[PDB]
């Protein structure tokens, strides 16, 4: 992890803006504005690990209400409608969690 060094602080500054709403979590456009899909697959491992505070290897509603705190400060509390839709979109597998390889490619569906 290290959401500045691995990625780009400027791109992150735009990205935290691209989620600066209640429910309007355009993950596809965040992952574009932050340059994520332009960084390495092995960078995308260090990406996911910044959101998975637990280091349990899976992100779920407890973290996913404020996942932005791994992207940077000024993050805030996401809406109850957001977390519901975001877990249901971000779990491509059917296990109810965001996994890294899903999250990387979930946004390539753009």
> From residue 72 to residue 101, what is the string marking binding to Ca ion with x (rule CB under 5 A)?
-------------------x-x-x-x-x--
Q: Three-class SS of residue 90?
A: helix
d(CA 65, CA 61): 6
**70: contact with Ca ion by CB under 5 A:** no
Q: 109: annotated binding-site residue?
A: no
> From residue 4 to residue 43, what is the string marking binding to Ca ion with x (rule CB under 5 A)?
----------------------------------------
d(CA 15, CA 99): 20
**25, 19 contact by CB (below 8 A):** yes
d(CA 24, CA 87): 14
Question: Which residues are documented as binding site for Ca(2+)?
Answer: 52, 54, 56, 58, 60, 63, 91, 93, 95, 97, 102
């Amino acid at each position: 992890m290290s959401m500045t060094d691995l990625l780009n602080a400027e791109d992150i500054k735009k990205a935290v803006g691209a989620f600066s709403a209640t429910d309007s979590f355009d993950h596809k456009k965040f992952f574009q504005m932050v340059g994520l899909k332009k960084k390495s697959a092995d960078d995308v491992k260090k990406v996911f690990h910044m959101l998975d505070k637990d280091k349990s290897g899976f992100i779920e509603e407890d973290e996913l209400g404020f996942i932005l705190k791994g992207f940077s400060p000024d993050a805030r509390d996401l809406s109850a409608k957001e977390t519901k839709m975001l877990m249901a979109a971000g779990d491509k597998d059917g296990d109810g969690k965001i996994g890294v390889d899903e999250f990387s490619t979930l946004v390539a569906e753009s």
